[PDB]
Amino acid sequence: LMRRCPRRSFTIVGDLAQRRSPAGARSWGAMLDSYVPGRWVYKSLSVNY
Amino acid sequence: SVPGAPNRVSFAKLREPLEVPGLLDVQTDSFEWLVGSDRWRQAAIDRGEENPVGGLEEVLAELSPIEDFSGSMSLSFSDPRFDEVKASVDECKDKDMTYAAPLFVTAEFINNNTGEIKSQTVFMGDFPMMTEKGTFIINGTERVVVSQLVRSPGVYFDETIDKSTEKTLHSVKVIPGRGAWLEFDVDKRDTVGVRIDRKRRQPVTVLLKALGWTNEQIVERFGFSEIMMGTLEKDTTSGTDEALLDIYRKLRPGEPPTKESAQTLLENLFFKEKRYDLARVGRYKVNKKLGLNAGKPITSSTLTEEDVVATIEYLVRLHEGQTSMTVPGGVEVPVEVDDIDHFGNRRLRTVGELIQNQIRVGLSRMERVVRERMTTQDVEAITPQTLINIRPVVAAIKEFFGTSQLSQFMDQNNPLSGLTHKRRLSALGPGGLSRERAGLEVRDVHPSHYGRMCPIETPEGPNIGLIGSLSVYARVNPFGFIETPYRKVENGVVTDQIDYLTADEEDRHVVAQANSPTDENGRFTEDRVMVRKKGGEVEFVSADQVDYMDVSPRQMVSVATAMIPFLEHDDANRALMGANMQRQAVPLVRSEAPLVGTGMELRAAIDAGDVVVADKTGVIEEVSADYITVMADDGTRQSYRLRKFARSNHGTCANQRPIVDAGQRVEAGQVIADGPCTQNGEMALGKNLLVAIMPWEGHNYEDAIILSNRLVEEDVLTSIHIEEHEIDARDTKLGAEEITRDIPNVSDEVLADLDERGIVRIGAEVRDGDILVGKVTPKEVRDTSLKVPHGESGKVIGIRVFSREDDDELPAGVNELVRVYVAQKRKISDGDKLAGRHGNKGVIGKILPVEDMPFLPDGTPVDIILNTHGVPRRMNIGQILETHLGWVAKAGWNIDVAAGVPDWASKLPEELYSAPADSTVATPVFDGAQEGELAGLLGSTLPNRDGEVMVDADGKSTLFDGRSGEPFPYPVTVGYMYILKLHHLVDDKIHARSTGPYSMITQQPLGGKAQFGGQRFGEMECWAMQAYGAAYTLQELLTIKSDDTVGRVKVYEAIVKGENIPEPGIPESFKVLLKELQSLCLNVEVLSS
Amino acid sequence: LLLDWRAPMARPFYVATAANPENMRRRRQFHTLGRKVVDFTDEILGRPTGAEHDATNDAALLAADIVATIQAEQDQVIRLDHTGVLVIEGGPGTGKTVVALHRVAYLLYTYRKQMERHGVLVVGPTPAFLDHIGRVLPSLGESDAVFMTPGDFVPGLHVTAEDTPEAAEVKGSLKILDVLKAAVAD
Amino acid sequence: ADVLVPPQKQEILERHEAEADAIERKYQRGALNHTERNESLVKIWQDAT
């Protein structure tokens, strides 16, 4: 995907704790720091309603 | 301003704040800059420019010093000096010489091994000079160097759609005056790449590292955009040395690299002045864009690392879609694409700059030879004269004025033609553009042309849009950008301060129309005003939202366009046609200024330079057809020589006639002799004819014109045409060509006119085939006499002979040269093209007797009849307006102001309340006679000799039929119209051929009237013949008449012997094919079936 | 009578939020299958009351200050002018899908000129995001957007079978890249 | 005299001019895009012609 988007403009939506694949992400940093170290912005939603 | 101009009442209602400048200043000022004339220096030092430098001084300073590898020897140049011209203009045009002055420069040689200096004056050659008329006289002919439009040096950004992915992609290129190009771009995969000197594309980060940037510096300066970071992280190169080696390989393939050259290659390529520079105009443009080097003046002409980094940043910001950019430390600037068509980018190479560039090339060759021959001479005795080789520089100058596209034969058809030629702006030529470059796009009218290039004038041929004309009020910057004047406007009151704005300056402000109703002090009366906005968008804005105003409505038009009356009532197409046709009107034996015209004929005629103007105030002492003598009040005596029946470059008559008599007092600047097409100092390109607008028996059908025989009887449209015949005698492998009265095997009567030299006597009548000068050559001799070509005739008016025995400078091999001039009066005849100033053109279909024309109730016959069906569908109704006003001018008018002025006459200046018969009036193009004023003047016309008015308020008169005698059932529009005799006479368009010369390359008949060729029988004509089913005629055309030689001669003999033409068959070109087929062992056989 | 979605006064429909309402109280979406409106769903740009009808039930769920903090957080996610890699995470029942849809709508609207030619790629187990994009930006969803599952990255090919949970892990890590090179070296 | 000008040419124009003004008015409030504003003006002036 990063090869297909050199602009590095991504809207990444997911939840690590709901992963079912073995190759799925265990930490967003481990996946993204290789391409946008520190430049990617993390937002987390807190309230369950 | 002309002391002795004729009176011409004007309909103008606006007051001119600025007078028209010297029309041909674009030539004279440029050349004076080139030679650093005193006038130019004084003009420039007063503009604010400190320490002005001329073109020759510029190139010589650029050249010097010339030094060897060790730096021991040096050579410098200074002080270019011009001696007196070798011969006068008249003598130059008489003896086929070049109007030139010797050029001298002081050259100083320095030898550091001893410190001794040796200054010496070096003769650099005969520099061709420019006459006061703005022309160069080369080898006896008059030539004009047209200004050339070129994309100015700078940095240009653009965006284009990818033809593969349809994606939009951004790019930038740096265009220098000289040196390698540098381009950057963003490709369809969002990777930023750089092309150095048009080589293979590579990542920009490679070049950045090549400039000494490290990854940390790149990620600091950039990183605002992710594409640059991606390019950096995806680059297989690290280190300045690595990038320099890669660039060396991609610039100089195969050859071994080295650290010694790694930095040197780039430094020489883009940064050292002796190989790369922005020419002081690219530097200014690159400073204005990118916000670099603001405030302090232009100091160096070369590029800098800062420029490259700023260009990269600007390109990336533009790709990101930003609008504002600020270089660290620089001024904030907009981020936008650059329009290459805008005159903010296109600049004008004047004549001086072109000549300067050619001198620069010649000086480069001289520098090469000097650098070569310093090593081969004893340093202890070398002097500036031994080192200097002036053959290359004089060769360069001689070649520029010879086989060059921009230096062109002067358009001497009429004075206006030459004047418009001088003010021509040619987009083509060396460095302009080529056949592979823009077509439709570059030929368009751009909003920035307003007031700088005329949107109407352009040659009819293949150069529509590529060649334009400078506007009347425009002028060139020192950088070459065309400025135009505007009035300042403050607080809604039009101020009297005038500023010359360039297109770039103009785009930043709002400009109001010239026809703005204002109070006495300039306050706008209307709350809203028509203005031009930044993007060339016309808008209506509040009166207090205007910064500048047009000086005059004539701002956007040129001279010929400004000479079209009632221009605003004609569509642009017919206006263009009329402007171009004004440029090709042939001079007439008698000139006649237009009865109704513009206030431009006088100034255009005086500026064209074909009228003789008194140098200073004095009293006429002696007037002759050949010369005029003036005794000045200062005590000096002037004698002006007049050109009489001289041949123009196009073959027209250039006779000059005095218009003053002995004992008259003339003010300085007053016209004392009229030119080819002037009356009393103003344009007289045509004649005023009485015209009736009506169809007449079909003889004016499809734009044909009917002329009265008076125009033939009274020589109204007669012209004088002069043709030149040249012949040379040379050396040969068998002897030399000889000229004598004796010619072998000819009758005694064919050489009766010849004089002792074998040359036709002056005053002899000569026609088709008559011997002009007899020349006998070795094969016992062979006749090779010059003879009048087919269909040509006239009287011998002049002979010019040059001989090697008299030290005449004929070319090598030629022993003698003779030119004979033959003059003929051409009457107006059927098929000759007549035209007005409004695009109405037609050939004469009939010349009726005087009593056949429709005639007015007093018995006056009309001179010309124009069909009614031509006017309405072409939107050239201005020709009608003129027709009415031309009548009111011929017969005076008197407005009845008894019970106050009429409402329709409230705007007419009091000088227009009345005028006598045969009066001349002036109606500017966009400010003149209104419809209501003209309608009232039609009803205010004076009675004729008999006391009755023929043309009524409608402009129509009752006409009697000259043939039947009955009055025409309805009144017809009758007036006076100014018409031109165009240089498209049928006399030189009739061509016929039964048999003649053939091309030895294909054996087909030649092509051309002067080559006595045949007409083209095109493939579509073959299709048309095929559709008829006319096999025999098509075969005859293809076989006998073009290719078959044996069939050709056979048919000719058959015709002359009165026997039926034979059957063509078995063509030669078929026999060759059949024999080739047989050669391949193919048994090709023709079957009888 | 109808505003082009690119018109300036239609800007709020894409950028307005419950925390920063651009002078609007309710935003109504119509779901259309042609010349007909199948249904409409409303969202209040403010504190809800539960009487409003929306298929997502956001108004009713929020009607059932902590709500102010929810609005503030959602606005912070949506309005972020990052133009970069944004990772939105949330536990179930928090509504990360709604916030992500609003965020992508805002981003696509504000940068439409810059992305009208490049196109937008959507990846996931379902085209729901492309459904929303098409229902709010048809000019972009219909002709510019693209959808791909992780088994459909390769053009032409369309895989659906899934590998065992250990071969996939090695095949799903860059540690296998060195293998691939070796393979072409083999 | 025979190139007649219809007396209803001054009224028609001004009427349509009013409409043009209205369009610009709606463009100043942001109810119109630039290209669509130009299209509306072109249609109005075609009707006027």
Secondary structure (DSSP) of B628-644: EEEEETTS-EEEEE---
| B994-to-B300, B987, B1040 alpha-carbon distances in Å | 70, 20, 12
**Cβ atoms < 10 Å from Cβ of B931:** 13
Picking from B497, B440, B402, B457, the residue whose alpha carbon sits closest to that of residue B579 is B457
Cα-based angle C105, C106, C111 (whole degrees, multiple of 5):
105
- Catalogue the long-range contacts made by B170-174 (C-beta closer than 8 Å, 24 or more residues apart): B170/B315, B170/B318, B170/B319, B171/B315, B172/B311, B172/B314, B172/B315, B174/B286, B174/B303, B174/B307, B174/B311
Residue with tokens 């000799």: B945
Which token pair is B415?
């004075």
**Structure solved via:** cryo-EM
> Which other chains touch chain C, taking contact as 3+ CB pairs less than 8 Å apart?
A, B, D
- Cα separation, B335 vs B319, whole angstroms: 10
State the smallest CA–CA distance between residue C74 and chain B in angstroms. Answer: 26
| Resolution to one decimal, Å | 3.1
Residue of B nearest to C114 (CA): B321
**Can you list the alpha helix ranges (DSSP code H) found in B273-350?**
282-288, 305-320
Indicate the helix (H) or strand (E) that contains B127: strand B116-128
| B1030-to-B725, B1060, C46 alpha-carbon distances in Å | 45, 19, 90
Exposed, middle or buried: residue B635 (CB in 10 Å: 0-12, 13-18, 19+)? exposed
- Cα separation, B144 vs B404, whole angstroms: 11
For chain A, say whether C78 makes contact (Cβ under 8 Å). Answer: no
Q: In chain B, which residues have their Cβ closer than 8 Å to the Cβ of C117?
A: 166-168
Picking from B243, B282, B289, B285, the residue whose alpha carbon sits closest to that of residue B266 is B243
As a whole number of Å, the end-to-end CA separation of chain D is: 23
> Which other chains touch chain B, taking contact as 3+ CB pairs less than 8 Å apart?
A, C, D
Contact B512, B489 (CB under 8 A): yes
Which amino acid appears at position B443 of this protein? Answer: R
Q: E strands within B13-115?
A: 66-67, 73-82, 100-111
Say if the Cβ atoms of C94 and A17 lie within 8 Å: no
Task: Tell me whether strands B548-550 and B596-597 are parallel, antiparallel or unpaired.
Answer: unpaired
Say if the Cβ atoms of B954 and D1 lie within 8 Å: yes
- Cα separation, B931 vs B937, whole angstroms: 10
Backbone φ and ψ of D30, nearest 5°:
85, 15
- Cα separation, C101 vs B763, whole angstroms: 100
State the smallest CA–CA distance between residue A28 and chain C in angstroms. Answer: 8
- Cα separation, A49 vs C91, whole angstroms: 11
β-partners of residue C27 are C43
- Cα separation, C95 vs A49, whole angstroms: 8
- Cα separation, B11 vs B911, whole angstroms: 9
- Helix, strand counts (H, E) of chain C: 9, 5
For chain B, say whether C164 makes contact (Cβ under 8 Å). Answer: no
Residue of C nearest to D33 (CA): C7
Q: Which of A8, A40, A41 to mutate to test the interface with B (most CBs of B within 10 A)?
A: A8
Q: In chain B, which residues have their Cβ closer than 8 Å to the Cβ of C113?
A: 321
Q: In chain B, which residues have their Cβ closer than 8 Å to the Cβ of A6?
A: 189-191, 226-227, 230
- Cα separation, B476 vs B147, whole angstroms: 11
Report the SS3 class of residue B1078: helix
Contact B122, B144 (CB under 8 A): no
Contact D33, D23 (CB under 8 A): no
b/e string for B972-986 if b means 16 or more Cβ within 10 A? bbbbbbbbbbbbbbe
Residue B541's contacts (CB-CB under 8 Å, 6 or more residues apart) are B510, B528, B529, B531
Say if the Cβ atoms of B191 and A7 lie within 8 Å: no
- Cα separation, B279 vs B58, whole angstroms: 11
Indicate the helix (H) or strand (E) that contains B692: strand B686-693
- Cα separation, B519 vs B526, whole angstroms: 10
- Cα separation, D2 vs C169, whole angstroms: 93
For chain A, say whether C125 makes contact (Cβ under 8 Å). Answer: no
Q: What secondary structure does DSSP assign to chain D, as a single string?
A: --S---TTHHHHHHHHHHHHHHHHHHHHTTSS-HHHHHHHHHHHHHHH-
- Cα separation, B549 vs B370, whole angstroms: 56
Say if the Cβ atoms of D1 and B953 lie within 8 Å: yes
Residue of B nearest to C117 (CA): B167
Backbone φ and ψ of D16, nearest 5°:
-65, -35
Which token pair is B486?
């505007």
Say if the Cβ atoms of C8 and D30 lie within 8 Å: yes
Say if the Cβ atoms of B189 and A6 lie within 8 Å: yes
* Residues of chain D numbered 1-20 and touching chain B (CB < 8 Å): 1-3
Task: Tell me whether strands C145-148 and B9-10 are parallel, antiparallel or unpaired.
Answer: unpaired
Which token pair is C141?
């969803």
Regarding chains D and A, contact by 3 or more CB pairs under 8 A is answered as: no
DSSP B172: E
Look at chain A and count its residues. 49
Q: In chain B, which residues have their Cβ closer than 8 Å to the Cβ of A9?
A: 226
